[PDB]
Design a protein around this nucleic acid. Structure first.
Ligand code: ADP
Lengths: 56, 68, 68
DNA sequence: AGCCGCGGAACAAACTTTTTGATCCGCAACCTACTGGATTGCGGCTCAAAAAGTTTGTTCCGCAACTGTAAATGTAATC
RNA sequence: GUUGGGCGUUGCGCCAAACUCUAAUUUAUUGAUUACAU
């Protein structure tokens, strides 16, 4: 389960009802989808990000 | 033990190199030394700084697989 | 000392016995002691088999939160 | 107190092995005698497309023994 | 598991006694100390 390979790959879809059936009966609790949902839900609320790009 | 001790030259002072690989155990009978070649690479790196368009040598090898 | 979850830990494993068992809750740090036995067992294996003289080490994320 | 080559690693583009979402085509069904329309429907089989799983070329990270003028020192024991 | 005593088929075997905060001393041509040769 949860590892860097899912969180570090964070960097859209409207989460329709027909989605959550997808990749369900596979056998793994994919934290990557949960993290993407978390990001998408909380993004509903740029200059600093541009500053981060320039400073880097 | 096994060692390759080819020695290079640039129209002047000899710049040596020893490429060695020994099985663990008998370890003191052959060791590598890249002192001269590192120095020569530093010389070319400095040359590229003082003169951006400085001449460099050509190194290439061709096996039988050129046309096959 | 100031590893993942232990401030100061000292343990002594029995020598006349050939089995040690760690028992505790999920969140106490039994995995931490095994992860600390490695990163040193890796170093021992590296210097017993290879000539690399390298291995694992304590990463920045494993530092105890607040310490240095 | 400085940092040699060696070999794993942390990343990151390419291959490469399947997960999915239609499309199709026998293929028995109707319907009635049988190509019954001017029909549907239904389950194996196959399709690239794309979200997942290796594989391979490059870049830093770390670390050892001792260094240029230079102590053989009767016994035991300390750092 | 560790510590001090005793005997001598003594570079240590045995006997007789004790103690448990969760938990055993290692460096020389150096310096300090005991001791012989001065
Ligand atoms: N940077 C940190 N700060 C605080 N706690 C930490 C930190 N890193 C690790 N830990 C602690 O280490 C614990 C992880 O437990 P773990 O080593 O996996 O043993 P186990 O698997 O038996 O539960 C966690 O309880 C977590 O709180």
């Amino acid at each position: 389960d949860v590892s860097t390979r899912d969180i570090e790959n964070s960097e859209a879809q409207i989460w329709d009802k027909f989605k959550a059936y997808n990749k369900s009966l596979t056998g793994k609790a994919d934290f990557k989808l949960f993290f993407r949902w978390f990001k998408e839900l909380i993004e509903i609320e740029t200059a600093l990000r541009a500053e981060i790009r320039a400073k880097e | 033990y096994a060692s390759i001790a080819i020695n290079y030259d640039y129209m002047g002072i000899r710049f040596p190199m020893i490429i060695a690989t020994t099985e663990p155990g008998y370890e003191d009978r052959a060791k590598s030394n890249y002192s001269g070649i590192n120095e020569l690479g530093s010389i070319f790196k400095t040359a590229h700084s003082i003169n951006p368009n400085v001449s460099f040598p050509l190194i290439a090898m061709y096996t039988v697989e050129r046309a096959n | 000392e100031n590893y993942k979850g232990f401030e100061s830990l000292i343990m002594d494993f029995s020598m006349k016995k050939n089995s040690t068992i760690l028992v505790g809750n999920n969140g106490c740090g039994k995995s931490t002691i095994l992860d600390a036995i490695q990163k040193g067992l890796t170093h021992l294996s590296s210097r017993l088999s290879t000539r690399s003289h390298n291995g694992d080490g304590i990463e920045k994320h494993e530092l105890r939160k607040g310490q240095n």
